[PDB]
Amino acid sequence: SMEDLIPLVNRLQDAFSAIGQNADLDLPQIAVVGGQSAGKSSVLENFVGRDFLPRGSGIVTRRPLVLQLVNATTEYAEFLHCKGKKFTDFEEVRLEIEAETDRVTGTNKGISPVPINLRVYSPHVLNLTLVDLPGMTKVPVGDQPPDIEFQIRDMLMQFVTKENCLILAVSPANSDLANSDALKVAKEVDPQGQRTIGVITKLDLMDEGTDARDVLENKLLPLRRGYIGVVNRSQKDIDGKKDITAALAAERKFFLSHPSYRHLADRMGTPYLQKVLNQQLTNHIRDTLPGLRNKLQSQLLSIEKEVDEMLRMYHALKEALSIIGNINTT
């Protein structure tokens, strides 16, 4: 259903344009959340299919980045704060985004609440909103204040409460697993797990002697989709510019030994997480379409029976209805 939905959504916007109405589908946004240093950027960029999110040492997501994807013929990017700037090199794009974060916070443990605004045009995407958010913490590191936790936490909470927010729930191993920022937020919005996949990352770095075994066996609090684990890029990995395919290879090794996950091994990996999330998205789009269709029918009728000599309506309305119908049938 995702595959057939994509083209129909663009077509629907065009019909709306002709009516001269401000009518949009308002595609739901997806937000990635997780502890400090979680691999948050890695997860998000893997879904998008591109290297464009800054990654570094220590604190990585240091400013929220609100990216709106725009269907367009040419492939390029532009910043709100950099009016008119033309790249054309996607490796350069990545670099520029990273640079802007350094601009305000430096690379010495950072933080700023001011969003970076980026528009990435592509002809193979939904007009979506994705958000990279600062890592929530429990104890201060570097020069961060004692109340670091409370500043960061608030910031990301404004995005994840939005109805229909696919949560990329990343959970850091350097914090207690039961105290998981990811699992907390994920459970709050979508308790039954139609679109929540509980993901525990960085599993190879967990402190000796702790585990979430009952929860992770899908028995303690059973979820329809269960839990899928992943092992993303480590500190050495990010430092080196280790590329996307490589990161997946490290995952395999850990999972064979961990008691809480070996029986569920066939329902593990990044790739499996991908499949589930897409399905939910489609549902929202369709639901809004019946309402419009009906309005259009009513307007036409009146003038026709008294034929007002305002025959211009006839043609405009007819067009809109056809587009709507096709999406409704799927």
Binding site: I303, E306, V307, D308, E309, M310
Partner: peptide, 21 residues
Amino acid sequence: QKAMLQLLQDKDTYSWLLKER
């Protein structure tokens, strides 16, 4: 009332009668 009934006679003045614009 009786005069008001008289307008109905002309069929081909039908569509010619109707417009409401």
